[PDB]
Amino acid sequence: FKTKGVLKKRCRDCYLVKRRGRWFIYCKTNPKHKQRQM
Amino acid sequence: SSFSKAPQQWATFARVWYLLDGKMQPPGKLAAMASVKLQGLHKPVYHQLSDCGDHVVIMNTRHIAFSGNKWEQKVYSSHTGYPGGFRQVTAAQLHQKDPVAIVKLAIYGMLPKNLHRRTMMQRLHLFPDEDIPEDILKNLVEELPQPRKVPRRLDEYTQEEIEAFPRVWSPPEDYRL
Amino acid sequence: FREVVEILDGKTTIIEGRITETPQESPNPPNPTGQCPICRWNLKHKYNYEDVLLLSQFIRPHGGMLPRRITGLCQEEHLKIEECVKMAHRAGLLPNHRPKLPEGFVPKSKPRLNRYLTRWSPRSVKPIYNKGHRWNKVRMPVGSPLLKDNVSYSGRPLLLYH
Amino acid sequence: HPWEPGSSRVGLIALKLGMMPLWTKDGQKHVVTLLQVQDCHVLKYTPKENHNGRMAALTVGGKTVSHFHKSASILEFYQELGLPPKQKVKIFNVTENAVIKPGTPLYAAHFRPGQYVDVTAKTIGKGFQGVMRRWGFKGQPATHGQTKTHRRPGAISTGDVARVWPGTKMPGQLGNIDRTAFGLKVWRINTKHNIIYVNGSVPGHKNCLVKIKDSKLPAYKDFCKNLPFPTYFPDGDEEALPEDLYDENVCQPGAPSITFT
Amino acid sequence: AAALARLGLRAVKQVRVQFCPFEKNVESTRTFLQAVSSEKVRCTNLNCSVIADVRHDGSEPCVDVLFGDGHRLIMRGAHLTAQEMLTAFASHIQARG
RNA sequence: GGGUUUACGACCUCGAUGUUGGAUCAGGACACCCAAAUGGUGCAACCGCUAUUAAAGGUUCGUUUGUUCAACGAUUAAAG
RNA sequence: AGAGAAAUGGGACCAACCUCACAAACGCGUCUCAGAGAUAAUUAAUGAUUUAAUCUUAACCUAAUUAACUCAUAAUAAAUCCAGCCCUAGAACAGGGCACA
Ligand SMILES: [Mg+2]
Ligand SMILES: [Mg+2]
Ligand SMILES: [Mg+2]
Ligand SMILES: [Mg+2]
Ligand SMILES: [Mg+2]
Ligand SMILES: [Mg+2]
Ligand SMILES: [Mg+2]
Ligand SMILES: [Mg+2]
Ligand SMILES: [Mg+2]
Ligand SMILES: [Mg+2]
Ligand SMILES: [Mg+2]
Ligand SMILES: [Mg+2]
Ligand SMILES: [Mg+2]
Ligand SMILES: [Mg+2]
Ligand SMILES: [Mg+2]
Ligand SMILES: [Mg+2]
Ligand SMILES: [Mg+2]
Ligand SMILES: [Mg+2]
Ligand SMILES: [Mg+2]
Ligand SMILES: [Mg+2]
Ligand SMILES: [Mg+2]
Ligand SMILES: [Zn+2]
Ligand SMILES: [Zn+2]
């Protein structure tokens, strides 16, 4: 996970979901694309 | 009207015990009327130097209701005086620990900040449920109306009211719920 | 309404669909020329989270919302009704619109705290430990800003942050 | 009543005699403290709802004292009970099924060889002691120029706080306070003299009254199953216990002078 | 078709869709047939026999799956959605087989 | 965004707010050095590098130097 | 995953060693040190808006989960005798003993 201010999908398999009040770019193929909106 | 001096004085400055249901009621709206009745601002004979103050018995404190996300947001901060003794508890944790503490602190904050606050707080009786001793029950005079109208649930609605309410839309027969 | 039923008779699975009778719209609406259900039954800026008799018309038996393409509400009314159904579910109205779990109904937990006009979810909000001073005060949101257009008979605006 | 898994037993009030060495069969040498149960009697019983709402309270008295130095109320209470006055009076939280009738005697055979106990007593009071002996503070150097400071506490607070905190360690009373030693193992029970041999050190000076009870540690919560549940009744068995009940590892005085193999 | 291709249909013997194309409730069954007879579903297993029975007066569209566990899934689809039939068939295939 | 360094300003004190380092005692912040729970790695393993949460508790002994620092010796879970 | 040992710190204590020309104090010496809930980050189960999926600032119950923090639990917790004399109790005042002998 990388805590960022601006989330952006780095590939076509990244999905944006709202959990625990925050936004999260989750990626199953490339786990390094995990982003968390601060 | 044509009373003697001592009974007239007694009748005028007599104390009254009010009852207050706190089930599904906001603690601040409870504390408003509680503090008014505690100070005596409901008497046209009121004065700050007089001891005019009525007793308030609030029941069903455990069943109190908080608006919004206050149960998880509102914190209560205390300090034991010792270094490192600063505690901040969530309202939900404080309610789970001591049920009366929420409305107690609400009324304490709504009361005036003079030395009479402790005296008129001694005339406040809070109970978590409908379990009031007989000695206190035998003192009650009237019950104050609840400040918030509790809305009914869907199961608490009568079939007559449900059928009287119109169906605003028509679901399709081929849809599956 | 359509129901999917399954029949197991000796390693033979039969999936069947059964259509039952459904209630229709009331015959006399007050504004028949309105394209929208709410905005033609004149309930616009009238309902709230307490109006369960209106919020329960279009929801699934498990508390879920119904699609807009199936219901027919205008987008703003759909969002308002979605937030109102969320607030009712959080406040405790509509208690029979939950899934039946006979294994999970036995292990009782801490009693449910009574609440109403809850905007966020109780499992996502963090406690405000600082609370701010008078000039910079961390206000607590109450209700939704989507219901700011409702009719105010008293004339005072609704305090959405307190 | 029969024993239950969530039961609590009553305790005793003994006298700290002294310390003795005690060897175990593996060659190790421990130190035991001798607690003599002189006159232990259950004085009164307070019900659970009238004491705590969770567990009942049994009051136990210690060794006998003189009638001529007690007050009228204490003397009236002991006259109504039927016993001479006791010196130390303690309260033990027991369960509702382990209650005993007030006025019953309690003996050291209440505890059995091999068990863990809790021992409460007032520690040896050292009076108004300095900060170095009370809190273990380090002093200043002895002779490298220091002037009249070799045992002072030094700085007590910070300049910005403009005050000192309530938890400030400062000279004062040291010792005359109640402390509890946890998990002391019992090795030996002398039934003739009513003496208990508890492992290790016991708070308080010798010839002082000590409140002994079962160990409330979570590791020894269900040890009371094999012990006499209500108490030790010497007249119920109608058979005298041995003079000394030892543990399974204690080198008894009469021993073959164990040698390794 | 993709959800079936990512399922490993190797454990199915015969799938027959019997319907009448001149009815008003055969849309779901026709799309079910086209999804279960796609190219990916063909190439993931070549031992399966996909039959499309076309009648005129049957008036009851249905599907029958006999797979090598000795199992028979029979679904008379007159009001079910194609998506629901697909999910049911996929869940049953992944449960038994 | 913070107010740790140097500077800038000259607002409180010049009928006195005693000025560096050490000894004693430390309070607190977290922008966590250790200990704890995890995410990503160009993470094979042992070692690592980053990021998230967490401040109840710890954070060594010596030579030189008045030294804070700094170099060096031996360790520690770490020597914030 | 399973067994032990030790150090630090909290609280205590002299059977022995050591300081020890008072009977005591003392370390260099000895004894003991704990259960439940709770969470933040982060994982998955069911499931609509968005009849698929989706840990949910969607409801229902969910489970694996840091340190804090609270609570089980422990300590104190018998009021109006106190002249004098002792004390392992103490600056004073307090506190424990004074019938066995
Ligand atoms: Mg002394
Ligand atoms: Mg020294
Ligand atoms: Mg000098
Ligand atoms: Mg000197
Ligand atoms: Mg000098
Ligand atoms: Mg100050
Ligand atoms: Mg500064
Ligand atoms: Mg500048
Ligand atoms: Mg100036
Ligand atoms: Mg100027
Ligand atoms: Mg000056
Ligand atoms: Mg001056
Ligand atoms: Mg400090
Ligand atoms: Mg942090
Ligand atoms: Mg670490
Ligand atoms: Mg620290
Ligand atoms: Mg120690
Ligand atoms: Mg779904
Ligand atoms: Mg998944
Ligand atoms: Mg407690
Ligand atoms: Mg006395
Ligand atoms: Zn990606
Ligand atoms: Zn509309």
Coordinates of N, CA, C and O in Angstrom, one line a residue, chain B residues 17-112:
Chain B
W17 N -41.4 17.4 42.4 CA -40.7 16.4 41.7 C -41.3 16.1 40.4 O -42.4 15.7 40.3
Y18 N -40.5 16.2 39.3 CA -40.9 16.0 38.0 C -40.3 14.6 37.5 O -39.2 14.3 37.9
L19 N -41.0 14.0 36.6 CA -40.5 12.7 36.0 C -40.1 13.0 34.5 O -40.7 13.9 33.9
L20 N -39.2 12.3 34.0 CA -38.7 12.5 32.6 C -38.3 11.1 32.0 O -37.3 10.6 32.5
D21 N -39.0 10.7 31.0 CA -38.6 9.5 30.3 C -37.5 9.8 29.3 O -37.5 10.8 28.6
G22 N -36.4 9.0 29.3 CA -35.3 9.2 28.5 C -35.1 8.2 27.4 O -34.0 8.1 26.7
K23 N -36.1 7.4 27.2 CA -36.0 6.3 26.2 C -36.1 6.9 24.8 O -37.1 7.6 24.4
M24 N -35.1 6.7 23.9 CA -35.0 7.2 22.6 C -35.1 8.7 22.5 O -35.7 9.3 21.6
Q25 N -34.5 9.4 23.5 CA -34.5 10.8 23.6 C -33.1 11.4 23.5 O -32.1 10.8 24.0
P26 N -32.9 12.5 22.9 CA -31.5 13.1 22.8 C -31.1 13.7 24.2 O -31.9 14.3 24.9
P27 N -29.9 13.4 24.6 CA -29.4 13.8 25.9 C -29.4 15.3 26.1 O -29.7 15.8 27.2
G28 N -29.1 16.1 25.0 CA -29.1 17.5 25.2 C -30.5 18.1 25.3 O -30.7 19.0 26.1
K29 N -31.5 17.6 24.5 CA -32.8 18.1 24.7 C -33.4 17.6 26.0 O -34.3 18.3 26.6
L30 N -33.0 16.5 26.6 CA -33.3 16.2 27.9 C -32.7 17.1 28.9 O -33.4 17.7 29.8
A31 N -31.4 17.4 28.8 CA -30.7 18.2 29.7 C -31.2 19.7 29.7 O -31.1 20.4 30.8
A32 N -31.7 20.2 28.6 CA -32.3 21.5 28.6 C -33.4 21.7 29.6 O -33.3 22.5 30.5
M33 N -34.5 20.9 29.4 CA -35.6 21.0 30.4 C -35.2 20.6 31.8 O -35.7 21.1 32.8
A34 N -34.3 19.6 31.9 CA -33.8 19.2 33.2 C -33.1 20.4 33.9 O -33.4 20.6 35.1
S35 N -32.3 21.1 33.2 CA -31.6 22.2 33.8 C -32.5 23.4 34.1 O -32.4 24.1 35.1
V36 N -33.5 23.6 33.2 CA -34.5 24.6 33.5 C -35.2 24.3 34.8 O -35.3 25.2 35.7
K37 N -35.7 23.1 34.9 CA -36.5 22.7 36.2 C -35.5 22.7 37.4 O -36.0 23.0 38.5
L38 N -34.3 22.4 37.2 CA -33.3 22.4 38.3 C -33.0 23.8 38.8 O -33.0 24.0 40.0
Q39 N -32.8 24.7 37.9 CA -32.6 26.1 38.3 C -33.9 26.8 38.9 O -33.8 27.7 39.7
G40 N -35.0 26.3 38.4 CA -36.3 27.0 38.8 C -36.7 28.1 37.8 O -37.5 28.9 38.2
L41 N -36.2 28.1 36.6 CA -36.6 29.1 35.6 C -38.0 28.9 35.1 O -38.5 29.6 34.2
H42 N -38.8 27.9 35.7 CA -40.1 27.6 35.3 C -41.1 28.3 36.3 O -42.3 28.1 36.2
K43 N -40.6 29.0 37.3 CA -41.4 29.7 38.3 C -41.4 31.2 38.1 O -40.3 31.8 38.0
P44 N -42.5 31.8 38.0 CA -42.5 33.3 38.0 C -42.0 33.9 39.3 O -41.8 35.2 39.3
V45 N -41.8 33.2 40.3 CA -41.3 33.7 41.6 C -39.8 33.4 41.7 O -39.2 33.6 42.7
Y46 N -39.2 33.1 40.5 CA -37.8 32.7 40.5 C -36.8 33.9 40.9 O -37.1 35.0 40.5
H47 N -35.8 33.6 41.6 CA -34.7 34.5 41.8 C -33.4 33.8 42.1 O -33.4 32.7 42.7
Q48 N -32.3 34.4 41.7 CA -31.0 33.7 41.8 C -30.6 33.5 43.2 O -29.9 32.5 43.5
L49 N -31.0 34.4 44.1 CA -30.6 34.2 45.5 C -31.5 33.3 46.3 O -31.1 32.7 47.3
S50 N -32.8 33.1 45.8 CA -33.7 32.2 46.4 C -33.3 30.8 46.1 O -32.6 30.5 45.1
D51 N -33.7 29.8 47.0 CA -33.4 28.4 46.8 C -34.4 27.7 46.0 O -34.6 26.5 46.2
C52 N -35.1 28.4 45.1 CA -36.2 27.8 44.3 C -35.5 26.8 43.3 O -34.9 27.2 42.4
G53 N -35.7 25.5 43.6 CA -35.2 24.4 42.8 C -36.0 23.1 42.9 O -36.2 22.7 44.0
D54 N -36.4 22.6 41.8 CA -37.3 21.4 41.8 C -36.4 20.1 41.5 O -35.4 20.2 40.8
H55 N -36.9 19.0 42.0 CA -36.3 17.7 41.7 C -36.7 17.2 40.4 O -37.8 17.3 40.0
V56 N -35.7 16.5 39.7 CA -36.0 16.0 38.4 C -35.5 14.5 38.4 O -34.3 14.3 38.7
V57 N -36.4 13.6 38.1 CA -36.0 12.2 38.1 C -36.1 11.7 36.6 O -37.2 11.6 36.1
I58 N -35.0 11.5 36.0 CA -34.9 11.0 34.7 C -34.7 9.5 34.7 O -33.7 9.0 35.3
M59 N -35.5 8.8 34.0 CA -35.5 7.3 33.9 C -35.1 6.9 32.5 O -35.1 7.8 31.6
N60 N -34.8 5.6 32.3 CA -34.5 5.1 31.0 C -33.3 5.8 30.4 O -33.3 6.1 29.2
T61 N -32.3 6.0 31.2 CA -31.1 6.6 30.7 C -30.2 5.7 29.8 O -29.6 6.2 28.9
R62 N -30.2 4.4 30.1 CA -29.5 3.5 29.3 C -30.0 3.5 27.8 O -29.3 3.2 26.9
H63 N -31.3 3.7 27.6 CA -31.9 3.7 26.3 C -31.9 5.1 25.7 O -32.8 5.4 24.8
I64 N -30.9 5.9 26.0 CA -30.8 7.2 25.4 C -30.4 7.1 23.9 O -29.8 6.1 23.5
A65 N -30.6 8.2 23.1 CA -30.3 8.2 21.7 C -29.5 9.4 21.4 O -29.7 10.5 21.8
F66 N -28.4 9.2 20.5 CA -27.6 10.2 20.0 C -27.8 10.4 18.5 O -28.0 9.5 17.8
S67 N -27.9 11.7 18.1 CA -28.2 12.0 16.7 C -26.9 12.0 15.9 O -25.8 12.4 16.4
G68 N -27.0 11.5 14.7 CA -25.8 11.4 13.8 C -24.8 10.4 14.3 O -25.2 9.3 14.9
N69 N -23.5 10.6 14.0 CA -22.4 9.7 14.5 C -21.8 10.2 15.8 O -20.6 9.9 16.0
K70 N -22.6 10.8 16.7 CA -22.1 11.3 17.9 C -21.6 10.1 18.8 O -20.7 10.3 19.6
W71 N -22.3 9.0 18.7 CA -21.9 7.8 19.6 C -20.5 7.4 19.4 O -19.8 7.0 20.3
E72 N -20.0 7.6 18.1 CA -18.6 7.2 17.8 C -17.7 8.5 17.8 O -16.4 8.3 17.8
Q73 N -18.2 9.7 17.6 CA -17.4 10.9 17.5 C -17.2 11.7 18.8 O -16.1 12.1 19.0
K74 N -18.3 11.8 19.6 CA -18.2 12.7 20.7 C -17.3 12.0 21.8 O -17.6 10.9 22.2
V75 N -16.3 12.7 22.2 CA -15.3 12.2 23.2 C -15.5 13.0 24.5 O -15.9 14.1 24.5
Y76 N -15.1 12.3 25.6 CA -15.1 12.9 26.9 C -13.7 12.8 27.5 O -13.2 11.7 27.6
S77 N -13.2 13.9 27.9 CA -11.8 14.0 28.3 C -11.7 14.3 29.8 O -12.3 15.3 30.3
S78 N -10.9 13.5 30.5 CA -10.7 13.7 31.9 C -9.2 13.6 32.2 O -8.4 13.1 31.4
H79 N -8.8 14.1 33.4 CA -7.4 14.0 33.7 C -7.3 13.7 35.2 O -7.8 14.5 36.1
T80 N -6.6 12.6 35.6 CA -6.4 12.2 36.9 C -5.4 13.1 37.7 O -5.1 12.8 38.9
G81 N -4.9 14.1 37.1 CA -3.9 15.0 37.7 C -2.5 14.5 37.6 O -1.6 15.4 37.5
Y82 N -2.2 13.2 37.7 CA -0.9 12.7 37.6 C -0.4 12.8 36.2 O -1.2 12.8 35.2
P83 N 0.9 12.9 36.0 CA 1.5 12.9 34.6 C 1.2 11.6 33.9 O 1.3 10.5 34.4
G84 N 0.7 11.8 32.6 CA 0.3 10.7 31.8 C -1.1 10.1 32.2 O -1.4 9.0 31.8
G85 N -1.9 10.9 32.9 CA -3.2 10.5 33.3 C -4.3 11.2 32.6 O -5.3 11.6 33.2
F86 N -4.1 11.5 31.3 CA -5.1 12.2 30.5 C -5.9 11.1 29.6 O -5.3 10.5 28.8
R87 N -7.2 10.9 29.9 CA -8.0 9.9 29.3 C -9.0 10.6 28.4 O -9.6 11.6 28.8
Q88 N -9.3 10.0 27.2 CA -10.3 10.5 26.3 C -11.1 9.2 25.9 O -10.6 8.4 25.1
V89 N -12.3 9.1 26.4 CA -13.2 8.0 26.1 C -14.2 8.4 25.1 O -14.7 9.5 25.1
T90 N -14.6 7.5 24.2 CA -15.7 7.7 23.2 C -17.0 7.7 24.0 O -17.1 7.1 25.1
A91 N -18.0 8.4 23.5 CA -19.3 8.4 24.1 C -19.9 7.0 24.2 O -20.5 6.7 25.3
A92 N -19.7 6.2 23.2 CA -20.2 4.8 23.3 C -19.5 4.0 24.5 O -20.2 3.3 25.2
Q93 N -18.2 4.2 24.6 CA -17.5 3.5 25.7 C -17.9 4.0 27.1 O -18.1 3.3 28.0
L94 N -18.1 5.3 27.2 CA -18.6 5.9 28.4 C -20.0 5.4 28.8 O -20.3 5.2 29.9
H95 N -20.9 5.3 27.8 CA -22.2 4.8 28.0 C -22.2 3.3 28.4 O -22.9 2.9 29.3
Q96 N -21.3 2.5 27.8 CA -21.2 1.1 28.2 C -20.7 1.0 29.6 O -21.0 0.1 30.3
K97 N -19.8 1.9 30.0 CA -19.2 1.8 31.3 C -20.2 2.3 32.4 O -20.6 1.5 33.3
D98 N -20.7 3.5 32.3 CA -21.7 4.1 33.2 C -22.8 4.7 32.4 O -22.6 5.7 31.7
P99 N -24.0 4.1 32.5 CA -25.1 4.6 31.7 C -25.6 6.0 32.0 O -25.9 6.8 31.0
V100 N -25.6 6.5 33.2 CA -26.1 7.8 33.6 C -25.1 8.9 33.3 O -25.5 10.1 33.3
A101 N -23.8 8.5 33.0 CA -22.8 9.5 32.9 C -23.1 10.5 31.8 O -22.7 11.7 31.9
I102 N -23.6 10.1 30.7 CA -23.9 10.9 29.5 C -24.8 12.1 29.9 O -24.4 13.3 29.8
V103 N -26.0 11.8 30.3 CA -27.0 12.8 30.6 C -26.5 13.6 31.9 O -26.8 14.8 32.0
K104 N -25.8 12.9 32.8 CA -25.3 13.6 33.9 C -24.3 14.7 33.5 O -24.5 15.9 34.0
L105 N -23.4 14.4 32.7 CA -22.4 15.5 32.2 C -23.2 16.5 31.3 O -22.8 17.7 31.4
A106 N -24.2 16.1 30.6 CA -24.9 17.1 29.8 C -25.6 18.1 30.7 O -25.5 19.3 30.5
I107 N -26.3 17.6 31.7 CA -27.0 18.5 32.7 C -26.0 19.4 33.4 O -26.2 20.5 33.7
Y108 N -24.8 18.7 33.8 CA -23.8 19.5 34.5 C -23.2 20.6 33.7 O -23.0 21.7 34.2
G109 N -23.1 20.4 32.4 CA -22.6 21.5 31.5 C -23.6 22.5 31.2 O -23.3 23.7 31.1
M110 N -24.9 22.1 31.1 CA -26.0 23.1 30.9 C -26.3 23.9 32.1 O -26.9 25.0 31.9
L111 N -26.0 23.4 33.3 CA -26.3 24.2 34.5 C -25.4 25.4 34.6 O -24.3 25.4 34.0
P112 N -25.7 26.4 35.3 CA -24.8 27.6 35.5 C -23.6 27.2 36.3 O -23.6 26.3 37.1

